[PDB]
Amino acid sequence: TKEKISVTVDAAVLAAIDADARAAGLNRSEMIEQALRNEHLRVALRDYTA
Amino acid sequence: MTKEKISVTVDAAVLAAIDADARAAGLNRSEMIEQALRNEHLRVALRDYT
Known part of the structure; x- marks a missing residue:
């Protein structure tokens, strides 16, 4: 099951993600899903302190 | 900087999880997705440079 949604994102970030998609043989939705x-x-990564 | 409104198609389970993370972080869906990207x-970039 997949949902089609609308999101607003920085245009520069989008161009970079499109390029990463191309490098991996993915389309934009697949690359964004990998990112998510x-x-x-x-x-969930943590920094211990003091 | 300019933001662009796009539509993407993503796994429903993946979307639920990132929505949950957004709520925990006090971000809306677009802000969290931009962080992910x-x-x-x-x-x-680091992966492909090494």
């Missing part, structure tokens, strides 16, 4: 899947992991 | 672009 990975960001879900990244937000 | 910024971080993924740097990830790919």
Whole structure:
């Protein structure tokens, strides 16, 4: 199951992600999905302190 | 800087997870997705440079 959604993003960021898509043989939606899947992991990263 | 409004098609489970992360972070969907894209672009740049 996949959802079609609308989002507003920085145009420069979008161009970069389009290029990363091309390098990987992906279309824009697939590359964005990869980014979202990975960001879900990244937000769980932690910094110990004091 | 300019922002662009786009439509993307993504896995429903992936979207739910990032929406959950957005709520935790007090961001809206677009802000969190842009964060995901910024971080993924740097990830790919480092990956392909090494």
